[PDB]
Amino acid sequence: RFLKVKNWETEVVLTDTLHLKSTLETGCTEYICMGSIMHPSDVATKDQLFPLAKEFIDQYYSSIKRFGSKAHMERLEEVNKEIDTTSTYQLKDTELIYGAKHAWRNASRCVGRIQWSKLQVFDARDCTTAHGMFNYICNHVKYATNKGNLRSAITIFPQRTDGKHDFRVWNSQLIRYAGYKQPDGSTLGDPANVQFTEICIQQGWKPPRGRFDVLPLLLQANGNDPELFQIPPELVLEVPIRHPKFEWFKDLGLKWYGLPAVSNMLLEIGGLEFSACPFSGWYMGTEIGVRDYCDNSRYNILEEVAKKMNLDMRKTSSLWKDQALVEINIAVLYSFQSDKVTIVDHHSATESFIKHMENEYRCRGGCPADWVWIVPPMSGSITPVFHQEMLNYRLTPSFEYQPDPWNTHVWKLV
Template sequence: MLLEQVRIFLEQYTAENKLAQSYVEERLQQFTAAGAVDYTIEEMDYALKLAWRNSNKCIGRLFWKSLHTFDRRHLKTVQEIYEALLAHIDYATNGGKIRSTISVFDPSVRIWNHQLIRYAGYKTANEIIGDPASVEFTQKCQELGWQGAGGRFDVLPLVIQVGDAAPVVFDIPKTHILEVELRHPTLEWFRELGLKWYAVPMISDMKVEIGGLDFVSVPFNGWYMGTEIGARNLADSERYNMLPIIAEKMGLDTSKNMTLWQDYALVELNRAVLYSYKEDGVSIVDHHTAVEQFLLFEKQEQQAGREVTGNWAWLLPPMSPATAAIYHRPMDNTKHKPFYRYQQAPYQNR
């Protein structure tokens, strides 16, 4: 059964890279003789690119070929893995000129974090300070001995586990963390809100299946679409919930929905995000340009003889979705392997 799934992947790899047909049988014979499947770095690299190309929820797939792979499957100790994660952060951040990057580790490795860099959330008797989405993980970090400063934007530590050994907590030195302080092109008071966000979204809790093998620690990143920060992370009522505060500072009437105060505040928050990232030289894309890039991706895939699948609800930007050219179009959400998928957090088993 495993070798059949391996064959399917190798046939796609061979066809798309225009290799000799004998390649598949040669590799299968090698795996059979060794008694184990061990993909080459070239095979892994292409599989991880394919997984991005097949990611139905991702609007940024135009750049799938640019993904840079760090093969870290040989690393066995938490210290080595920690250092590799810092190297990933540095390479991907690149002083703000963000590079799409992925690191692949041995299946025995688990990274507990949702993202390599993310803000803590502290639950107090009266409120949540920081990011409400991080409360559970923050509590786990505290149980493991980490003590955050209790602020709104404290970067969480990395938590790394190898096999059945106890997880180990590592702080991320500030020199490895690039953040953007948010300000507005015309609203001078915006800076006083004290908002900021980290430069690179590095997802670290998803897995990918490649030819029947699960790789459960494959942290990867692109760069932000502005609305991920401005229309979700900072705006959602279950996250930082900044719209009421911004609306009040703008002098808007928040007593009734029909004044559209949320819409006005949302636009200005997103303007601030895009303006600040651009001013600081940090890669970011607005949602209108992201849609245009997705349409170009579709065109390229059609020229290659491949149909694009996608999750309509995720591909539509969370802001002004009706302006997107894909708004009125039905979309096939069929999933093709390999692709990145969710998995249960290891600390939820404890």
């Protein structure tokens, strides 16, 4: 079977055969579509792990034109011995790099995947303690940041064993700003991080209580209680936000960090689960300008910005929110570009994703993609992805969601 997708702007039609390889569930049924559900849908047994390992080893050896080779067949037998004797197995370095790259290649919600094959993989599977995790993360940050010339990277900590010895980064990203609920109901800093800020304070973090405090790392090794570490400030690259035309913009006192580094997801490769695998790229401007700064539940600066623009805020039909939103996103891109910190605007990024998708259809037989996430949160239909039909399905290796660790961790101290 084949499935066709069409671009209604260009009338290009692409043919998807890759979906036949898909694995788990989308959440949809034959009679209900759950395409807009954010999160739809203890550890594996010996019998569950065998076919998962085989499928991955088979696809790795197919990718390197050695399917059926002597090395293919011996690797399969070796993997089987490990599962039989130890109930799990260990990836070779080559397979770990391949697995990490393809989890990114398969991330249907990521618009930046044209870069998937240029990913720096830091093998941190020898780590045993939170102090070790801190060291590996500092090196990751320093390498990825590269003085503003940002480089994609992932650091992979020991895989899950019995489920009782998980490695976890408790932060949702390596670098985020704290949030503080005030007695009067207002919020200082990032409202999204109020709860995680509370957890850090309880663990002994002494907060400066400002609007852009870089949070400490909260690191869990081997299922032990997590521990606090301050990222050395010289490794946190930040950009003060100014506007090329409104000289008053800098008086907003806005800044942001340069490195987007997701640290709460789970990396699954051949049935193995890497519960701590922080990865980073570089920003698309709308992540900051639209979501971080203008979500009502976030820094929520639209009112303040429109006021300084003297816009008429009496009625919605004046589109004052729309006008202010554009200017804010102009300033974000101008600021990063001026400080020579890597950033991509939504027009350039969506254009590259369409080229990526077409190449993937030609060379791989498809490209799973989540339209709801791929279309930027402003100016949707003037980007080419809006007009692009997409098919969403789950391939493995994959990045997955997992519960927040504080909802499952059982504490040990006193």
